[PDB]
Design a protein around this nucleic acid. Structure first.
Ligand SMILES: [Mg+2]
Ligand SMILES: [Zn+2]
Ligand SMILES: [Zn+2]
Lengths: 1335, 99, 73
RNA sequence: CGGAGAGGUA
DNA sequence: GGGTATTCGCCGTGTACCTCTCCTAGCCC
DNA sequence: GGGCTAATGACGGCGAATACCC
């Protein structure tokens, strides 16, 4: 129908064009009759008629008189819908300052007038004055005054000078200002003046001004003159059940405003003295303030008791304003909800549903089939028929259901498996039966959860539901390729019981030709369920080009496992079933079934798993009794010896040997050791409980005790919970978080005392409150992430770029945590993979990679894979297809359109419930030695020390890859070197971290070069030996004279001349910091690498701080420019550091709060982006120094470390596209041959499509700089403003879009959701292809 | 508790909430995000326009379902117009534009 | 009687042209005329349209030729 | 048919 | 002057139900 | 009884507004 939404400022002519009458009188209704009162808020002759097509006096109740107004009462007879459409207005005697431009911070009239806000509030609230056109006076133009100063201005200049007060004077200020002269003056002062705050405020002022001249607005429109009023139906008069009216407070506000304005007109009729009308106009300004935004000015007005009331800003802001209450979430007809129940006989492509709800929902369909069969032609008798529920209507209902899907929906919708589709099957009763496996997708137990049904009406929606949102179409998850149809608890227990090997029972040691007679034996009872038996199976391998080959043999197996074999489809091998079949096992069974046999065998295989699992879990009888938990008899002795040991440590404290904290730590360690002893004891005594005969004497096997199976299957709980049910439940924390010194010795199979139960009550309530507030911050995180990656839709098929990030598996300095395969898997390469058979084109450079190709990659042992990424995608207004690779939860590549930002935000913020909130290296594996950023020399001992700070140790294995990586400090003691081989566990990496090294490059004499004794240094004598050391102190405790007398240690030869360092001509001068302990004295020659001085010394909000990209509490700063380093002026607050390039220009300095333990010396040459003081790594400096790819690598490795530490895996693509939408904006360096301003901030895609064609012609492009905004910030500064009106505030956004006149072209999801057309994401993206192809 | 077509609300032409007042469910905000996450679009378009807000579209929908057709007629959500009359009830000029 | 729409996506890999093609054909088969070219199982035109997709004889091209020829007639 | 306030359900 | 150096407000706050009451009360006729 | 009848138990971030040395 239409296009972009234009916004601007209200003009008084536009206001008078909008309205259809002045409300001159503040009445509301008659309240004696129900008729409205003339010319009040509920006015007929302004707004329209109460009832449809009936005049107020009752003249023309006929449709024939449509259009003609009355003359007895003057009512335009039309519908009553026009009382929803016509606005109104109030003529105002006083011009009025609009409140948002007053107090937006930044105030638009505030910085527009180049005037502080305090004087503006003093002018508006009638307690000051201001100058309008002083001229030839002693008074400046912007100058504000007071009353005695007003008497002065009456004395000296009661003539030609003039001045006013209040908002009328602000209107005169806005009328009395040229804009082009202000533009010229501010541009000149930008070219001339050289102060940073002046540059900032003037560039904001000139941005506002030249944007405002670009806008079609006048500044005095920011001062209200005529107040537009809402239609009456939007502020309606509702009576309660009684003789009153409890309405909205808008009507009370307008009542106050009209009374105030009419009494002000009457007090401009009687010509009052001016102090009273100052107070009266102040009350009117207050009234308009309270009408627009109550509470934004100080102490707010109220309604009922003292409670602050609702205004327009409350109608648009906040949670319960219209965007989050009535636009993005709307109540919807054809809906229902009930308590869920199971009905296990169902297949997963269907759900149960009550008959009465189905008869409630599908009423128009039943009406349609009723008058199609013609059992009742009309509709009212038909409605009585469906009210009666006669004999024919149920067959009609079974007609209209049979192939019509519905949507099922648990209310806390975290991720996109919160809503699915099902084909209903009518069930008696009153509760929704629901297929059980799918419950694990909803995270919905049967404790009383209320799932809601919706019904699609139209034919396209039925095809969307059956074709996209069906349960069959979703068996993998958009988190990652773990199938979400993992079975939950009962059926996995039944399977784990069904495939296990007892050593002897009936049928042990015979042979069987087929699994059919195995089932025939088990249903007979003439055998065990499970016994190691050689049978014949037959498997079907499709090793050829999609062609079945049947092979067979005898396999040793168990009998129930053979029974399970009659369920698996053809292509799976036998070895998938020959194990115990835990939860991980059956999950990867379904995964391999999906990877080999497509879809339909996997779905029917899941159905048959569920049926047979429930059947043989019923045949099992896996109960639990009190004798099913076995207390180890060692526990009495273990607690006794632990009590003896803590008595020993306590009596060693009362003798005075140790401290209290040492006692605390040693006692808590011996308690933890005894706890692990109890753990080992109970785990042994469970898992080898079965010691039985074998048809011979004796044999142990894995135990058929119940709770060991319910823990070993992985059904519910793990070693922690079964540890608490048998052994002691360790230690619990106090509310301060200090771990409690006297642990919980008892266990739940025995009794508990009062006290340990009380301690665990502290722990449990702490856990519950943390889950509550954790779900709170998780919800707010999900909301921010869906409104920061709102706009992003895959729109193209290739962008044809070579760039991409690098992929290596993750190592912190322990095991290789997540291997190269899973990060590479499903993503499309950037450049070709080069095996170390160098120049072997192993894969083509721009191809998709699935799991067979990943096995080809892994067995060829590839160490680093260059791959395309979403942040490096080069797509205009979107993301290309091949940078996104496999759409996870499906097999193939992403289709053209299917938007990823929403599934990214959901798959990040979903496991937030499952999260938590609040020396020397012994190298492990065996391989050759590699170093990165290496610079080394051999010491006097023969060992190898490293003369570079940023050196990493890599351990090449026997394969060639990197399996171990370690952070080595500057100057470690290696027993081996590079180009060599170390053994498994041979100690090489060792250093002393407590002392920073002064290890020397060269050898020679150490004189006392620039070492002043008594003024710069001090002489401290070690009391333990007597061989002392010189001690250089800091900059403030000594005098200021020796502050510029630097400590130095310079190497000279046997002739005393300066030893020349190879590489330069500079000697070896070594500078020292304050608070050091200088080692040597005169007359000693040092070795290369010799110490010359003894130098002294995270949860969900971590995630939230990363996506905000905050500076931490102590930001680790880095080097801004390459070159040699040098110090500067001492302690003008900080210590300044100046890097001078070897060939470039020096003048950047960086202040350092020098209380930090710094890293760099004074004579070092470093790369840009190199560390100065250590600490947490700030993201913005990494972007503006290192690059885009390094900073996205940092964020993805940190947040993958968090989500992987909690063990719930998220694929990298979602995090990467969030990172892309973080840095969507940019900042301009130079204008170039384009027309952008220098300090203009503008988004990256806009300036990219700008300068892309400006290089395509003869002109030159421009330079930019991407700045890395937070998630909540880059949502705001967008092409749209309606998204930011939906997100987190309204006042700032709508003032900015008001002064911009920003023509809001839709371009995105939620904007197109508000206007209610199709979403340009999927089927709507094809629709918008068509409509954009029109224009 | 369920609903086919009941009372609509007064300040916004939207379905009511509750069982006592004979209303329907709330298709919440994250559910709109869930539908956006799937490639489905027509479901959402008839959801928050035809089945919920626009009076002309839903009355013609009622006639079309009793007359055998399955076809939506989008038009415009009424709540969007209510939002626009409130923002225009501020000192803000906001309008609609070209064909 | 239809559980999966996998083969329909095997014949049209885009999965959104699936929805538009099936919806256009099923609208033209719902209200009047242009009889389904498959035997039916007392099931609605949704399942009929997807079933005729999985017989391969419905895509965007057949609808283009037939609508163009009905325009020519 | 509106909004508060209190309790409970996940 | 002017660059940090504080302080001064602004603003956000998990989704979806269900049950119940109480709604402008003031006040000199 | 009624007919008009017009305070105090958050908290983190964050950016704009001054203060105060230098
Ligand atoms: Mg639950
Ligand atoms: Zn009349
Ligand atoms: Zn790309």
């Amino acid at each position: 129908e239409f296009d972009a939404i234009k916004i601007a400022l209200a003009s008084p002519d536009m206001i008078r064009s909008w309205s259809f009458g002045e409300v001159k009188k503040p009445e509301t209704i008659n309240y004696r009759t129900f008729k409205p009162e003339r010319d009040g808020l509920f006015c007929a002759r302004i707004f329209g008629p109460v009832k449809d097509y009936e005049c107020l006096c009752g003249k023309y109740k006929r449709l024939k008189h449509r259009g003609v107004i009355c003359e007895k009462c003057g009512v335009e007879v039309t519908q009553t819908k026009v009382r929803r459409e016509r606005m109104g207005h109030i003529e105002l005697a006083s011009p009025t300052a609009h409140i948002w431009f007053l107090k937006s911070l930044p105030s638009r009239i505030g910085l527009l007038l180049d005037m502080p806000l305090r004087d503006i509030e003093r002018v508006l609230y009638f307690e000051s004055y201001v100058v309008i056109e002083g001229g030839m006076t002693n008074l400046e133009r912007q100058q504000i005054l007071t009353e005695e100063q007003y008497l002065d201005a009456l004395e000296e200049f009661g003539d030609e000078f003039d001045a006013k007060m209040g908002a009328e004077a602000i209107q005169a200020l806005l009328k009395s200002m040229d804009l082009e002269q202000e533009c010229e003056q501010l541009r000149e002062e930008l070219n001339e003046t050289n102060s940073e705050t002046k540059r900032k405020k003037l560039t904001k002022r000139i941005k506002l001004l030249e944007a405002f001249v670009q806008s079609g607005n006048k500044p005095e429109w920011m001062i209200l003159t005529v107040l537009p009023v809402l239609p009456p139906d939007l502020r309606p008069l509702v009576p309660l059940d009684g003789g009153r009216f409890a309405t909205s407070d808008l009507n009370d506000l307008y009542r106050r405003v009209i009374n105030r304005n009419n009494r002000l007109k009457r007090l401009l009729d009687l010509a009052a003295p001016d102090i009273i009308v100052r107070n009266e106009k102040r009350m009117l300004q207050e009234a308009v303030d309270a009408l627009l935004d109550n509470g934004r000015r100080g102490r707010a007005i109220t309604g009922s008791n003292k409670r602050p009331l609702k205004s327009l800003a409350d109608m648009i802001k906040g949670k319960q304003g219209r965007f989050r209450q009535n636009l993005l979430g709307k109540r919807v007809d054809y809906s229902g909800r009930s308590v869920i129940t199971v009905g296990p006989y169902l297949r997963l492509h269907q759900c149960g549903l009550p008959k009465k709800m189905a008869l409630e929902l599908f009423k128009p369909f039943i009406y349609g089939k009723l008058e199609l069969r013609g059992l009742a032609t009309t509709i009212k008798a038909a409605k009585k028929m469906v009210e009666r529920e006669e004999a024919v209507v149920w067959d009609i209902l079974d007609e209209v259901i049979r192939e019509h899907p519905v949507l099922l929906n648990r209310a806390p919708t975290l991720h996109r498996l919160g809503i699915q589709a099902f084909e209903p099957v009518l069930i008696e009763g009153k509760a929704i039966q629901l297929h059980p496996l799918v419950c694990a997708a909803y995270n919905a137990d049967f404790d009383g959860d209320q799932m809601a049904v919706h019904v699609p009406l139209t034919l396209e929606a039925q095809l969307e539901a059956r074709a996209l949102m069906m349960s069959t179409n979703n068996i993998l998850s958009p988190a990652n390729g773990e199938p979400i149809i993992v079975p939950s608890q009962d059926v996995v227990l039944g399977l784990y019981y069904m495939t296990r090997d007892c050593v002897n029972a009936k049928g042990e040691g015979m042979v069987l030709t087929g699994p059919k007679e195995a089932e025939r034996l088990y249903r007979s009872g003439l055998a065990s369920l499970h016994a190691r038996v050689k049978v014949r199976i037959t498997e079907y391998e499709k090793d050829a080009n999609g062609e079945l080959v049947a092979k067979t043999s005898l396999k040793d197996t168990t009998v129930g496992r053979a029974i399970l074999w009659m369920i698996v489809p053809k292509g799976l091998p036998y070895s998938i079933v020959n194990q115990a079949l835990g939860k991980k096992a059956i999950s990867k069974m379904l995964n391999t079934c999906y990877r080999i046999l497509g879809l339909k065998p996997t779905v029917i295989f899941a159905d048959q798993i569920m049926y047979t699992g429930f059947a043989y879990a019923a045949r099992s009888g896996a109960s639990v009794g009190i004798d099913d938990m076995v207390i180890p008899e060692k526990k009495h002795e273990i607690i006794s010896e632990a009590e003896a040991e803590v008595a020993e440590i306590q009596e060693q404290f009362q003798s005075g040997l140790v401290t209290a904290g040492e006692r605390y730590n040693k006692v808590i360690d011996i308690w933890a050791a005894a706890n692990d002893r109890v753990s080992k004891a109970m785990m042994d005594n469970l898992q080898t409980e079965t010691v039985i005969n074998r048809d011979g004497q004796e044999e142990k096997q894995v135990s058929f005790n119940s709770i060991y199976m319910m823990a070993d299957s992985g059904a519910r709980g793990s070693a922690a919970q079964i540890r608490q049910l048998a052994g002691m439940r360790g230690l619990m924390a106090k509310p301060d978080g200090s771990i409690i010194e006297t642990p919980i010795t008892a266990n739940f199979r025995e009794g508990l005392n009062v006290l340990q139960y009380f301690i665990s009550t502290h722990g449990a309530r702490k856990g519950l409150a943390d889950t509550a507030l954790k779900t709170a911050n998780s919800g707010y995180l999900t909301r921010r992430l869906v409104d920061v990656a709102q706009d992003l839709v895959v729109t193209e098929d290739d962008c044809g770029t070579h760039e991409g990030i690098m992929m290596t598996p993750v190592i912190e300095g322990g095991d290789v945590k997540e291997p190269l395969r899973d990060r590479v898997l499903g993503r499309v390469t950037a450049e070709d993979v080069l095996k170390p058979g160098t120049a072997d084109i192993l894969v083509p450079r721009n191809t998709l990679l699935h799991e067979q190709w990943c096995d080809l990659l892994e067995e060829n042992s590839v160490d680093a894979v260059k791959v395309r990424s979403v942040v490096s995608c080069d797509t205009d207004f979107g993301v290309c297809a091949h940078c996104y690779g496999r759409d996870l939860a499906r097999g193939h590549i992403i289709n053209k359109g299917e938007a990823i930002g929403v599934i990214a935000a959901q798959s990040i913020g979903e496991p937030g419930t499952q999260l938590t909130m609040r020396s020397s290296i012994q190298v492990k594996n065996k391989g050759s030695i590699k170093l990165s950023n290496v610079k080394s020399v051999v010491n006097s001992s023969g060992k190898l020390v490293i003369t570079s700070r940023n050196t990493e140790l890599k351990l090449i294995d026997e394969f060639g890859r990197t399996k171990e990586s370690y952070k080595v400090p500057y100057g470690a003691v290696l027993a081996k070197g590079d180009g060599e081989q170390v053994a498994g566990g041979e100690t090489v990496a060792n250093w002393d971290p407590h002392t920073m090294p002064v290890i020397t490059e060269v050898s020679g004499f150490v004189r006392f070069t620039d070492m002043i004794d008594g003024q710069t240094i001090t002489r401290q004598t070690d009391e333990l030996t007597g061989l002392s050391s010189l001690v250089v102190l800091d900059s403030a405790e000594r005098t200021a004279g020796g502050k510029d007398l630097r400590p130095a240690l310079k190497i000279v030869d046997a002739q005393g001349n300066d030893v020349l360092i190879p590489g330069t001509d500079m000697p070896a001068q070594y500078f020292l910091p304050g608070k050091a302990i200088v080692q040597l004295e005169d007359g000693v020659q040092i070795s290369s690498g010799d110490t010359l001085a003894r130098i002294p010394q995270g949860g969900l909000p971590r995630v939230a701080d990363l996506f905000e990209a905050r500076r931490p509490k102590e930001p680790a700063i880095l080097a801004e420019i390459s070159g040699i380093v040098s110090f500067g002026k001492e302690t003008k607050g900080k210590r300044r550091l100046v890097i001078t390039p070897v060939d470039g220009s020096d003048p950047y300095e960086e202040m350092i709060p020098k209380w930090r333990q710094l890293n760099v010396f004074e004579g070092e040459r470093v790369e840009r982006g190199d560390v100065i003081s250590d600490g947490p790594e700030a993201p913005h400096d990494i972007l503006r120094l290192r690059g885009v790819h390094a900073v996205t690598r940092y964020i993805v490795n940190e947040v993958q470390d968090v989500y992987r530490l909690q063990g719930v895996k998220i694929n990298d693509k979602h995090i990467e596209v969030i990172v892309r939408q973080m840095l969507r904006k940019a900042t301009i360096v130079n204008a170039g041959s384009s027309d952008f301003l220098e300090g203009e901030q503008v988004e990256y895609s806009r300036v990219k499509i700008a300068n892309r064609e400006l290089e395509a012609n003869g002109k030159v492009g421009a330079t930019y700089s991407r700045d890395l905004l937070g998630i909540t910030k880059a949502s705001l500064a967008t092409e749209s403003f309606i998204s930011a009106a939906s997100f987190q505030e309204t006042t700032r956004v709508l003032t900015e879009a008001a002064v911009a006149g920003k023509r809001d072209e839709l371009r995105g999801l939620k904007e197109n959701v508000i206007v209610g057309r199709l979403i340009p994401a999927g089927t709507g993206y094809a629709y918008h292809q068509d409509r954009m192809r029109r224009r | 508790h369920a609903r086919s077509t009941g009372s609509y609300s007064l300040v916004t032409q939207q379905p009511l909430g509750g069982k006592a007042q004979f209303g329907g469910q709330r298709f919440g905000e994250m559910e709109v995000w869930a539908l956006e996450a799937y490639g489905a679009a027509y479901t959402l378009q008839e959801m928050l326009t035809v089945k919920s807000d626009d009076v002309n579209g839903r009355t013609k929908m009622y006639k079309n379902i009793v007359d055998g057709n399955h076809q939506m007629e989008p038009g415009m959500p009424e709540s969007f117009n209510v939002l626009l009359k409130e923002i225009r009830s501020l000192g803000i000029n906001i309008e609609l534009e070209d064909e | 009687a239809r559980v999966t729409v996998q083969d329909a996506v095997e014949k049209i890999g885009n999965r959104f042209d699936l929805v538009l093609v099936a919806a256009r054909r099923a609208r033209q088969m719902q209200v009047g005329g242009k009889d389904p070219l498959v035997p039916e199982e007392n099931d609605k035109t949704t399942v009929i349209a997807l079933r005729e997709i999985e017989e391969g004889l419905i895509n965007n091209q057949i609808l283009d030729v037939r609508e163009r020829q009905e325009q020519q007639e």
